[PDB]
Amino acid sequence: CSELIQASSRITTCSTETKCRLSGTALIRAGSVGAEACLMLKGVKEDQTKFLKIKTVSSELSCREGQSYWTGSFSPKCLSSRRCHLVGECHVNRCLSWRDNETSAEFSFVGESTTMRENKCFEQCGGHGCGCFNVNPSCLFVHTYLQSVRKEALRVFNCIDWVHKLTLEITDFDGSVSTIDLGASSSRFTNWGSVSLSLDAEGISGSNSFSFIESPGKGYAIVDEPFSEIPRQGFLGEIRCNSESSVLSAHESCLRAPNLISYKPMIDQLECTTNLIDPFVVFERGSLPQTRNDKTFAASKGNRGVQAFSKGSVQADLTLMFDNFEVDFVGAAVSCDAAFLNLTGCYSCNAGARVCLSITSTGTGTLSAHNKDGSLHIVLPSENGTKDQCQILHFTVPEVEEEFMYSCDGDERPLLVKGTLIAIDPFDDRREAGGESTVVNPK
Amino acid sequence: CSELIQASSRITTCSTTKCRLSGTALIRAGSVGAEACLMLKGVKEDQTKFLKIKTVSSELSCREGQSYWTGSFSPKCLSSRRCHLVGECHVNRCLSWRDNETSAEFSFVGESTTMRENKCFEQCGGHGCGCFNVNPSCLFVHTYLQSVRKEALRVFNCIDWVHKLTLEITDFDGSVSTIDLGASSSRFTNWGSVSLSLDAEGISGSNSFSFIESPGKGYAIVDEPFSEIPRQGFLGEIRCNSESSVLSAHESCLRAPNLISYKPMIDQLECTTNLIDPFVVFERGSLPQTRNDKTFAASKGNRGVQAFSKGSVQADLTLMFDNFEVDFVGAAVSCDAAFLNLTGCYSCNAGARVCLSITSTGTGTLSAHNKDGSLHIVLPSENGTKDQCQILHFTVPEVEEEFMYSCDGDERPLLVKGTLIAIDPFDDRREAGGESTVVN
Amino acid sequence: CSELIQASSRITTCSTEGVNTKCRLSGTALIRAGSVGAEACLMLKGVKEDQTKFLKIKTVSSELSCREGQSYWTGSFSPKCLSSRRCHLVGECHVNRCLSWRDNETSAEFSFVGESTTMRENKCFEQCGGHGCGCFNVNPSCLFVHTYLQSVRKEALRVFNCIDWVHKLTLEITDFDGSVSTIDLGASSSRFTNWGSVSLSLDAEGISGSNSFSFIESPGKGYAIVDEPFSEIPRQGFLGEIRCNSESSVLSAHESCLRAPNLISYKPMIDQLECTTNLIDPFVVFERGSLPQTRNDKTFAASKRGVQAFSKGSVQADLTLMFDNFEVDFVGAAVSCDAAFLNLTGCYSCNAGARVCLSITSTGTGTLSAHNKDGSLHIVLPSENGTKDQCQILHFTVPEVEEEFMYSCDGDERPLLVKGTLIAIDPFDDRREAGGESTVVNPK
């Protein structure tokens, strides 16, 4: 039992059209995941007692997605062919006037594709030193196309709506147990009265913008940066498509930021390169579950989308109404014993460090702990028995040694969170790909 | 009537010693249109007094921060190629050319206060390129920018979101007044006081955003963080401090580096830009736009933007009644709800609009949820039949989703079904510019 | 006294485990935090005995502590280079050698430079040939370039984001003694006192708004806010386009530092060469956002370390009070205050905003609340017995501000005119050009 009640009152409710019903009313807080109000009720005018438990099972924010695109890993492949001045297409203005969608006759053997591709021409040296009788600039013709490095894609998306669901477990007067789902300003009729989410203060808060990646059949990941609305070089989605299949085939309908392919002309040699963000590196770094500002992001039931779970404290008021019954008393909290187990993770990182505790109690409650200056907060569930419970904290030193005071009933006792965390070196998701061209013999 | 009451108590208050006994009711705002019906009993006397409190709207006002003007810019250039050892084309000059130096090739060009730059690109020499001298020739270029359209756009961020909760209060005699309350504010009435005692209204979510004003044509949202300095490939890569400066493409405007591209072709030359079209950005996000159940729209008078909570509202009101306490409260009445239509897109920021036919016998709130609770609908119910709409976000083209609804708490099914359109991946970059005017 | 009472009743609490049956009867009071300086004055009466005692509860501060995530060091860097042009067929200037040059290949032209652990790169640019460029052969000459970076100033800056914002509500509680104690509450927390317990039963405090931001630490010189999202990797045109894992690595421009592609521009001029950078000046960024800074009524300041967000006006939290064997008898009434507009200093259309100051005359401790006509501007400031000045940040969009406020501490509002002149802040570019002409090496 948890101490959850904030207020208790009697209310008369009349049906205007004219019957009147008298109800006892209790304003309780959800408190935290696992918290449970134990209520014994007394009849208002009659001498009867009833029993009722209301338990906070979970607090979830469902991500309703907005804009979405597919991306992946890409790499360039080059065809090259240099002609002397006055040979082939290498006359006067042609090379310098070349268009990205004009294919040189040097590459006629190439059939038409539906692939992301471009064409270039670079003036090179002339004269004997470059195998030409003519001294004017020779023409290095280049045809390039993109290919998927691996035959799998990633779907990147933003979250526009975070829809709250507060799941409650209610043990009614008859002892029957039901699950009640409540949204914002929602009220549910029960056989003993009603229960309503009368004030909801749950929501995504903080100073960071973020988005998510779906890896088909391999889960989700968080991107700790704002969603990129258009293709931009140096950003995730600098190459993007409208389908999973178009990423795999590097289809021409994909969008890409300007100038993503580099060229290094070397007379008869030529390197075509890219320096793209590796989205799979991004995915592995932010692989769910991830916790940010006490919100745990993970895949929903059936891997349909992402959700933010509260695993500890919950900020929601619940108004209970009991027909013809009012509060006699509430169940008292019981103490719990907590022992530090381990601390694992990194410091100065978004993911943070995982602290695990062993919790022993004789009833369902909530462990609440804090460091001295109150900069750190631990909130974990307790029950009749002994379970390990973990959560994420964020530190900024390698050698952590911080004392906490904890309790489930208000009688605080010391607990030392001690461990070694690792550093994460500054990183760069860009990876060079590509290389020398395939040299075509002159025709 | 709505069941909004959370707590009821009898509180005595003492000044300094005069003491006043007031009935005290803690009610939830609930949602827009929700109305608390309170019959009071004389604490001292033997009178019954009726009182109604209705939530009319809940607005967050955007107090703006940094702001700039921008537009749709385009390049126009002059070019002139000279042979080596001719004119300025000597030794080091072309490779050493500075952006702010106008070539003597364009000595006929007057003074300017427009954004401009200058380049010199070496080109082929020798007989094949019309020069006796075999050394590299010099293609000089003078480029300035201009505004395509004769209109500009002001981009800005929002630093403060200031809450206003507007209440409609019905006195004992049936007199109706309107009260506005901000955070932690109270207001005296002729029957006591109403105060916003706990406010959980605010802008929450996983996205940062900004806004654009189009003078006399309304506002738009920008579903991306405000760009603090000029950056290539972002809105405001070119920006000015005024509207008039955008139209003249004045030299005081800022530019990110290297926004103008050059393609020298011996005697031909193209100067091009590939800039974000802010007008396209504007049209995509033109208000009203709804994000995380916040409806963003122009404030009345068309003076800045506001966020309206058109459905659910999270705020506690504390009511005090002088010498009166709560006798009873009006019961909620049930309503009938039927699906009307569903219009919009899927996997898009704007979302889709759902409309319901709602019939009831009194003022109240309709609440709905799909099976897994990932979708939520909150809409006002009234006596009679009225249409009500709200924005939802989906990720499939064919929607078929059963909702359970109630106004009184007794749930009934309802089917939201319709077809949503796709929005293809887009790029706001638009190519502009072209060939130069060739001198001589 | 403040009017903070929201509910009041008796609650009986009992052990239900079957061991020790101890039922305690408590009075219970649900109060709003209201704002900084808000103080509930509670006269309690005995529940089992004929006794009275006075109790006060005052909201002292509401702090959100930044638990940092990813972090990096940066600074202002500058390019320095050596250049040496060789004619075609001379030295390394053969076939396609110049066009094939790799960033990490030092030219033989610069064999004299010692071992280096500094950020550096090498280039080769083809230049003119023939007798006009001092060469016998007409194929392109080779301008070889070796470039290294250096830090201008001997300072560095640490840029970081905030992942967690841990709330702490501090209260001053005056017992029946007159004795005052300070208590700290986190979310859904309870603290026992000698008269019962106080618990933060509903917490509506948090970082809200439409902007993402991060922070900069200047070692021994405070912090700053950056009104833009943290950049996770080096990107040209952004803070952190060059970043390091330590302060000293910034100062030495160490090779372990990361940088975005092509941050060094080159201007080949036959035997002259300019190597330049146009990097974001992080010290300019720091100065613009120097703490304290107020955003959406949140005052960001140093912890005194790390950064915190203070709610100095309104505070949105409910507190649940339990009194052992005591219940609420009555509460102290709020008092009127009179406000006088002092001054208004700052800028318009800017993230920093403008600071308004009032002089608030009252007869007791409370809270002043005000609003302009359309309710787009809100003012919440602490009130005290006497005449005292108080200030807060507002945000405007005009150089000449004219706003009429209706203020109150009890509920009956009176007019108040706010009038001032705010400066404009022109659009800015944090980029600064650096570097210049190469040191020209003589051939060997």
Ligand SMILES: *[C@@H]1O[C@H](CO[C@H]2O[C@@H](C)[C@@H](O)[C@@H](O)[C@@H]2O)[C@@H](O)[C@H](O)[C@H]1NC(C)=O
């Ligand atoms: C609490 O559970 C008691 C039995 O649970 C036992 O389970 C074991 C796994 C181990 O944890 C033992 O220490 C436990 O005692 C049961 O006998 C009690 O009745 C329960 N207590 C309450 C208050 O329900």
Ligand SMILES: *[C@@H]1O[C@H](CO[C@H]2O[C@@H](C)[C@@H](O)[C@@H](O)[C@@H]2O)[C@@H](O)[C@H](O)[C@H]1NC(C)=O
């Ligand atoms: C409540 O509604 C009653 C019925 O509404 C009428 O108006 C029509 C528009 C349509 O809804 C029909 O059902 C009805 O003829 C009306 O008679 C009552 O006066 C209304 N009462 C109040 C208090 O609004």
Ligand SMILES: CCC(=O)OC[C@@H](COP(=O)(O)OCC[N+](C)(C)C)OC(=O)CC
């Ligand atoms: C028949 C004479 C001859 O063979 O000399 C060369 C040709 C032009 O050569 P090309 O462009 O056909 O192929 C060059 C091979 N490569 C790429 C290895 C350099 O004639 C000229 O010198 C220019 C007219």
Ligand SMILES: CCC(=O)OC[C@@H](COP(=O)(O)OCC[N+](C)(C)C)OC(=O)CC
């Ligand atoms: C008298 C020397 C002469 O006139 O011919 C020049 C030399 C090559 O010159 P270099 O590369 O050794 O140095 C010149 C210094 N510079 C480029 C900075 C001006 O010979 C050739 O052209 C090919 C053998």
Ligand SMILES: *[C@@H]1O[C@H](CO)[C@@H](O)[C@H](O)[C@H]1NC(C)=O
């Ligand atoms: C290339 O694009 C241009 C338009 O920019 C078009 O006119 C031309 O036909 C295209 N060429 C080919 C081969 O598709």
Ligand SMILES: *[C@@H]1O[C@H](CO)[C@@H](O)[C@H](O)[C@H]1NC(C)=O
């Ligand atoms: C830490 O403790 C938890 C809880 O039992 C356990 O699951 C986990 O494996 C432990 N990790 C390490 C590294 O010991």
Ligand SMILES: *[C@@H]1O[C@H](CO)[C@@H](O)[C@H](O)[C@H]1NC(C)=O
């Ligand atoms: C252009 O900029 C240079 C900077 O070196 C300056 O000396 C010069 O006065 C400016 N104006 C002109 C017309 O060159």
Ligand SMILES: *[C@@H]1O[C@H](CO)[C@@H](O)[C@H](O)[C@H]1NC(C)=O
């Ligand atoms: C959907 O129904 C609403 C309410 O009647 C109406 O205003 C709107 O025009 C309808 N939409 C379409 C596309 O018919």
Ligand SMILES: *[C@@H]1O[C@H](CO)[C@@H](O)[C@H](O)[C@H]1NC(C)=O
């Ligand atoms: C330069 O870097 C390449 C990889 O890009 C490496 O293979 C090569 O060994 C490096 N050369 C030197 C001299 O460090």
Ligand SMILES: *[C@@H]1O[C@H](CO)[C@@H](O)[C@H](O)[C@H]1NC(C)=O
């Ligand atoms: C404005 O008044 C405050 C209150 O005393 C004072 O601290 C500040 O210096 C004043 N500033 C100006 C510019 O008058």
